[PDB]
Design a binder for this molecule. Structure first.
Ligand SMILES: N[C@@H](Cc1c[nH]c[nH+]1)C(=O)O
Ligand SMILES: N[C@@H](Cc1c[nH]c[nH+]1)C(=O)O
Lengths: 420, 420
């Protein structure tokens, strides 16, 4: 009856392997930059995400799998990694390690989204974090690291986008501006936008429908860029200076509305055309003050995260494939009932240095050979009356059909030299 | 304010590395036996565990983190892997793949346990599964694989325990027997046991408290083993035949009650008496009929699972340590403020082929050298006014004190040949 809940799926085969390659590469680039692997629990106290992600965001308000612990306490399935990372930083007194502290991890993230496929309720992302410093070098580094993780995978058609949200103060003033300009024209907004006009009006910029877009155009709504505090623009220029020097091709966006509310200053995203909507492979930005929201001291930080599934799609789009699932080095086929157990014993003597499998029931040579082929085995191994009594095994390389009869002892060596 | 919820913890450093070594080894032994890696979602429809694990078990009744889908459906955080594996087997029509289908995975498991340390609410286990066959060779194989996963890690002091729970008929009769012997003495049972006496009385055997143990002793309660039917007895003997042949030292237990209700016939566990209570490193058994409980056809199966944390403790107990975390190949120390950014740029030119790190602020040579040493760096790199204007870098192997001044171009090669 039961199936895997919509939005989640079993990972195996080529799909699983691609994910592993992706995380493997991310591990290499991130750790070369000094990042330490830190894996946080699957769930945190619901407050870590409420306060952290901001009580006004879609995620917190209606997209988190939150439940209650038997007796008391509210727990929530991690929807994103940054807040948890900061929570960990705080808890482990990382403030005392030599700064900045770079952390990275790869794991599942959960988001309660309205059922109708949509996309994913359980997805996986690589998360990088640089904590303990306001230096714009880290922002540039974070952007380069994300860019390189994808670049190393073989992706070529990426679109880096950079911008800034100024600071909570600048963010506030821009919102006020939006209300003042939009409210008297409130009646020309999409129902969706009319709600967004209440909390975090900026979203109305990144909304769909023609109603909104045409209005914004005629009203001459000015870009979030025009509201950056000077220190903010100084910082952003430093980041651009570094990226240009590192030759990272980017485009400065008029405004980058990120789905989380802890962002301050730098904000970036890397896209890929070949995905359709949800072209974002990953993104990130600075988030000083988040630690304070979780009740800690001031701890500056920048980082990014990217969706493994998204990256996989991008790879597929660029024609990157994976080679066929390897079969067993040897597949033992018993010719008599007594032989089935002997095949098992022989297989055990060969493992784990050699991948040896066997049939659990006797069968004709041709049939068992058919099954060995069916399993992609390199060698077929026959165990009938003769070899059982002689303490030998009849091996047959399936590719050429070449056959060899040798003692059980030589088998490991013969196979290893013939395949290694 | 927030901490990692009791029963969960952040994995990093040596602790994380041990887990990876453990899973790495398990991967090798399991995949050599033909196991395919299959990772199931973090949560399943609550029914998969209710019906699967059995509605009478402690796990289902009061130890599962269950919550409601943002729109109805009851979802539950996976407390164990077998049911999910069978669910996957059913869903993907693996029944049409060549049998038996061997699957393995390593991941987090969640159990809502009463807060007071109590060990773990989120732990990790390696799970092996062999589906599609009643053959006792698979049971022996499952036992040998679990044994070998631990054996390969270096563990020597393991205690393998084997037993059987018979067939549904034998299981029923033993339960009846338990009721008949225990009911008239019902008043001497622990409150917990008095409930278990209603559905699946066998649990009362594997319960805690002295109140139960002493009673069972004086009453002369007979082992589940004496109640095995003929076919069950035959199957178990086959398993012992195989284990003895493979020289796997085991002890036949009178009654090895396991923690789940889907078990039928073979049941085994490997313990280590140097962890205190909870000496079970892992265990498993056969579970035909589970697929049917999930609404599928009859699919026989055996498997095991072991706690990575438990195994880690066992390793520690046997004195197995982890060495030194590698430091960066190069640690660039800026001598002027202008140099910090240059160090970053240089570091970026060297990565990811080389692990290069740098200080984010200028410092005196001696100080930066001490920091390079603290970080376990192979080479220290100086960037002061001289080298900045000359387009060079002053390298110093911290080991031999050998100092070299070379051009930025000569750096990647020199470092690679000096460390590769
Ligand atoms: N966690 C953010 C990305 C991020 C990581 N660090 C900073 N921002 C996301 O879910 O997109
Ligand atoms: N599911 C079992 C392990 C197992 C695998 N196969 C049969 N049993 C456990 O949680 O201990």
């Amino acid at each position: 009856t039961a199936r895997a809940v919509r939005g989640t799926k079993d990972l195996f085969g080529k799909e699983l392997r691609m994910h592993q390659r992706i995380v493997a590469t991310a591990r290499k680039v991130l750790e070369a930059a000094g990042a330490l692997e830190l894996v946080t629990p699957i769930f945190e106290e619901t407050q870590v995400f409420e306060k952290g992600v901001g009580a006004a965001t879609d995620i917190v308000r209606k997209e988190m799998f939150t439940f209650q612990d038997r007796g008391g306490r509210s727990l929530t399935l991690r929807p994103e990694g940054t807040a948890a990372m900061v929570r960990a930083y705080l808890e482990h007194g990382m403030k005392v390690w030599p700064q900045p502290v770079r952390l990275w991890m790869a794991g599942p993230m959960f988001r309660a989204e309205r059922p109708q496929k949509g996309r994913y309720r359980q997805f996986h992302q690589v998360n990088y974090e640089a904590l303990g410093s306001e230096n714009p070098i880290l922002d540039a580094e974070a952007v380069v690291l994300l860019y390189e993780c994808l670049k190393e995978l073989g992706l070529r058609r990426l679109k880096v986008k950079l911008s800034s949200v100024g600071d909570p103060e600048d963010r506030a003033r821009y919102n006020a501006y939006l209300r003042e300009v939009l409210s008297p024209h409130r009646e020309a907004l999409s129902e969706d936008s009319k709600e967004r006009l209440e909390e975090n009006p900026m979203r109305i910029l990144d909304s769909k429908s023609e109603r909104d877009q045409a209005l914004l155009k005629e009203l001459g709504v000015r870009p979030m860029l025009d509201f950056l505090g000077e220190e903010a623009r100084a910082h952003l220029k430093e980041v651009e200076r570094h990226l240009e020097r590192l030759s990272v091709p980017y485009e400065l966006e008029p405004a980058l509305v990120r789905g989380l509310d802890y962002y301050v200053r730098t904000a970036f995203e890397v896209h890929h055309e070949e995905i359709g909507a949800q072209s974002a492979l990953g993104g990130g930005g600075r988030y000083d003050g988040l630690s304070e929201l979780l009740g800690g001291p001031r701890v500056p930080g920048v980082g990014f995260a990217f969706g493994v599934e998204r990256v996989a799609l991008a790879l597929e789009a660029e024609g990157f494939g994976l080679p066929e699932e390897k079969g067993p080095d040897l597949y033992l086929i018993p010719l008599t009932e007594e032989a089935v157990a002997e095949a098992f014993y022989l297989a055990e003597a060969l493992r784990p240095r050699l991948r040896a499998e066997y049939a659990l029931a006797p069968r004709k040579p041709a049939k068992g050979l058919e099954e060995a082929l069916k399993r992609g085995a390199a060698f077929a191994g026959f165990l009938g009356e003769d070899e059982l009594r002689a303490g030998e095994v009849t091996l047959k390389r399936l590719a050429t059909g070449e056959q060899v009869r040798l003692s059980r002892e030589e088998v490991p060596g013969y196979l290893l030299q013939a395949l290694g």
